[PDB]
Amino acid sequence: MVVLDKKLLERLTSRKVPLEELEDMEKRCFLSTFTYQDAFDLGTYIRNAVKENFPEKPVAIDISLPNGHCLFRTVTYGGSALDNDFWIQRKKKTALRFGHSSFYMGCKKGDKTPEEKFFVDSKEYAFHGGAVLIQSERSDYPYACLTISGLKQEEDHLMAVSSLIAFANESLE
Template identity: 40%
Template sequence: MTHNQEIGPKFHPELTPPLEELEAQERRLVFRQFTFDDAWALGTLLVELARESQAPVAIDIHRAGQQLFHAALPGSSPDNDAWIARKRRVVERYGSASYLVGARFRAKGSTFEESSRLDPDEYAAHGGSFPITVEGVGVIGAVTVSGLPQLQDHRFVVAALEQYLGLDRD
């Protein structure tokens, strides 16, 4: 795959998947537990997938306020780290994927920036941060990617979680 090719299925960049599809992803992508070793293994998988596709991304995994994994690949920049922090804060505040949060605002005819009343320098409801949910516990952290268009960032994380958890794609 070349640098300019998309990761995952072909799609129109502005076409938001249905809310039901995004919500179903969150119900499916649940861990039995999430340890330091899980963070390392998931982060390493994300790096391998990004290298295979030459994706210019930064990758971050946080649990309970602690950074457990971080990697920056060629083509990424410090701006990606700022985007990671902003998208991760949305997951921490809303308990849902950053892309899903933005999609919910758009479905109501508004935008996150217009209606959330949150500082856009601190929060970004753009794709790429996905909640780490543990069965019987709830959301304990987030896995975040930044560097691709937002829907591609979201799909990249979802595909890696599906692979890591051994689930078939929708």
């Protein structure tokens, strides 16, 4: 069970969550162990949560390692399409490269475009919301990347972070 804070959303949708706050949310998403089964569980957990909060809306979910090995992929409602896979690669590439969520990086972009800010092709990179690194307690560097696509940007980002914290907080057992 995952609930999206609605005032945190819309305070995202309307901008003006400070970067240092965003980074604080992100750094809260970390896991103790990361196991092939962990990836499956978390992936399905997110899939269920998205189906719950957003019925009838198609969403693609991805968990991949920093080298690209894909562990989990699903599609939630089936209005999805190949373009989802492009967003997934594109957001994921940003998150893995810069070490922050792809929402955060869009925020640090503001206006001014990926090309002239970070000197990267925007066909390759995607500064919209859905990518969030899966952090590791004890590793200083991410286990993997979690990526959501097909909701409004702020939702993709908040679903990832929320699910990632909710999940991590059920290993309170």
